[PDB]
Amino acid sequence: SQQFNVAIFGATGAVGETMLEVLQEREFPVDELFLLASERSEGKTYRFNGKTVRVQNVEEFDWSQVHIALFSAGGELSAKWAPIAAEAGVVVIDNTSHFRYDYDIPLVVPEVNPEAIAEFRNRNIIANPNCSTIQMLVALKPIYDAVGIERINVTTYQSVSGAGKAGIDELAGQTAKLLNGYPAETNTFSQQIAFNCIPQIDQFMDNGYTKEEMKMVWETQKIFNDPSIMVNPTCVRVPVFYGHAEAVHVETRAPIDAEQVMDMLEQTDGIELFRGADFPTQVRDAGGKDHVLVGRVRNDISHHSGINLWVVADNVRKGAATNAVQIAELLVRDYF
């Protein structure tokens, strides 16, 4: 019956809005909820547990009112405001990339490295990993534990909702213009997205990979705490609204059969396994779900010790909001 004051910073964004919904759905022990944003968003209303909560300016907010803050207002605002909330004694769970690679801040997937949460005392900050990494690592954890992983080839099928509402509107807007004869203009993306696949998520790096691809690499090795897992991504934007899917081709360190992995995955909490000719898809199975979906599990015929799988999740939920709320749950349970 111990209750906590909770702030959500970025309350008017898809993830901030979903964090509220997930807090409500998972019946988090909240005494008071504060909703924070910039000045323009100030005065907007949302319902939490039956009561209207008003969005207030972060500039005017007294951080001492709060035990835990869930941040999802973009990297700039997290860099600016997280140290301030943390200085005030608030534990920040940060859904941006900003603190992920900072040497002493933990990067947590609760199904994977929940021990790392203990390192919240270093800076009063816990980093929430990238959506693609979260879902891949949840699916691969059982395999990693049983037999180890030497190398991951992964290609992604990423929805436009990763580029926020500017991406969603570009998809829906381009698609209507094209269908009704009008030309489609590009702004959020460098090429047309409607009825197209763009093999670029974020800017390029010196090595040919993009930042999104480089994030799956670095965040994987940090989270598994293993600088010897090799990760080889190609990240692609696809004309899908919500959910990300991944084709994962892994090389294990010891041999294991698809039947064993399927049994493990089925027994692991947070994983829904689809067998045989059934498999999850973004539109059909992923939308609105808090867990990770897998199918197409099979032995790699090209390698002595390989496993192939197909991984799907809702990138706004498990890929962000829900992962953060799950960190919060374990934080209050074991540290408060």
Next chain:
Amino acid sequence: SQQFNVAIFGATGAVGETMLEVLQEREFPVDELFLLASERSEGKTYRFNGKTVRVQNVEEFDWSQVHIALFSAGGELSAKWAPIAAEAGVVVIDNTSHFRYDYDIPLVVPEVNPEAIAEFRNRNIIANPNCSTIQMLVALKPIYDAVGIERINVTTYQSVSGAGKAGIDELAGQTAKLLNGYPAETNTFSQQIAFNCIPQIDQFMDNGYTKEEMKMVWETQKIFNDPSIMVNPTCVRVPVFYGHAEAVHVETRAPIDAEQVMDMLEQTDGIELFRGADFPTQVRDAGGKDHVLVGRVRNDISHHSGINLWVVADNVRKGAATNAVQIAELLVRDYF
């Protein structure tokens, strides 16, 4: 200036219509062109080299009128009609999967194994390979010749046109209905395709891979004439109309840098290499092209001798009709 009589069986399908256009565009030495189909689709006319050509019933066709036949009417009709055309002295180039794995029938990519065409004399039949395989092998051939290839990881981004006009109608259909509030009806694919990705093309095999996936394995091995090249595909249907893309992660037998592979490909005819922050996509670069497009060429950071690339082509053109017309060119040049 020697001219040949050419038949197209399956003249009213997208590939058969494209075969006609390609024969014209490439100025193939045709004397008479015959267009063949069923009884239902007949009396229809097409323009070819400024002449009007009438579609006739295959059942009533005298095959002795023709030197070469291009087949794209489906596997069942090829099994029926190809042996008939062959016994009459016609050389059949078959764009179906039916004959591709017959030991006595050559499976040909003219950029890759042009010498196999000689095997046409076994049964008067040459097989045209799968579209996804064609574009992959054109891209990998120069790498294969330089340093060899031990293993390929590939995942595909495959357009609905791979499923004929039924697939196109289903995509254009569902997309319209959903943007106007009506539910999606799935009549063709195993799941909704509009705004979705489906990690299944063709029937599931007992090893867990789909037939499309096994084609990429077996046809690659046959065409490179190498049972030791390991191929690991995941084939995914995407909400795109024309062109196939592939994310290709190859392991070479000797180290090679991305700078050398890029130089080779750019110097290879039939390949358009995209450097830097430029890359080909389906909608923007693939549609209407007869060649293979590649970008994102970069060293694989996860492996000592790995190269990653992005490969795109028009599946109806270089992935079908164009490849078939290129076989026919070498056939008349070197064997007639």
